[PDB]
Design a protein around this ligand. Structure first.
Ligand code: HEM
Length: 154
């Protein structure tokens, strides 16, 4: 699939707001993912012991990881589709080391959309959400294809 420049503009415009508070957005997103789909927490041996949302909010470690996730995703989005180099090491670690099924990438995509909708209503109308969903679908499709080449296609 291919996004138009207009679609990328909508995506990068709301992402510029996200970048005003990367740690806060990273936290909200990972917590939303863990509350909505608790099974995903089992993949993080580093966080698997967090029992409540209160514990999650208090975790400095979870917060640092959220920053790592959003910084990596932001670097990919800013490439506007030319992200093959950035995708390679990410696909390799998630397919071979962490073993993250595509289904879980759909779950985090949903969490990202939920949080942007909640925090940025004025910059995340229907068209902007459609563009963000298209950018994340492209990301998932490309990661899925890499998974297959790497022998996982999980
Ligand atoms: C927007 C999608 C995601 C991005 C951009 C992303 C990015 C990253 C980055 C950059 C790292 C550190 C380097 C590495 O190991 O590759 C990482 C580690 C990891 N990721 Fe992801 N990730 C994503 C989704 C997921 C999902 C949905 C899961 C699990 C349900 C997951 C589980 C893990 C685990 C288990 C680690 C290692 C954490 C640790 O022990 O330090 N990732 N991810």
């Amino acid at each position: 699939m291919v996004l138009s420049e207009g679609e990328w503009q909508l995506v990068l415009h709301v992402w510029a707001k996200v970048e005003a508070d990367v740690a806060g957005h990273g936290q909200d997103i990972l917590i939303r993912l863990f509350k909505s789909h608790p099974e995903t927490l089992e993949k993080f041996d580093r966080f698997k012991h967090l029992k409540t949302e209160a514990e999650m909010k208090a975790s400095e470690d979870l917060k640092k990881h959220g920053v790592t996730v959003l910084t990596a995703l932001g670097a990919i989005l800013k490439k506007k589709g030319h992200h093959e180099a950035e995708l390679k090491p990410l696909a390799q670690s998630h397919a071979t080391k962490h073993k993250i099924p595509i289904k879980y990438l759909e779950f985090i995509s949903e969490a990202i959309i939920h949080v942007l909708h909640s925090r940025h209503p004025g910059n995340f109308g229907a068209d902007a959400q459609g563009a963000m969903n298209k950018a994340l679908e492209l990301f998932r499709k490309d990661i899925a294809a890499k998974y297959k080449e790497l022998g996982y296609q999980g």
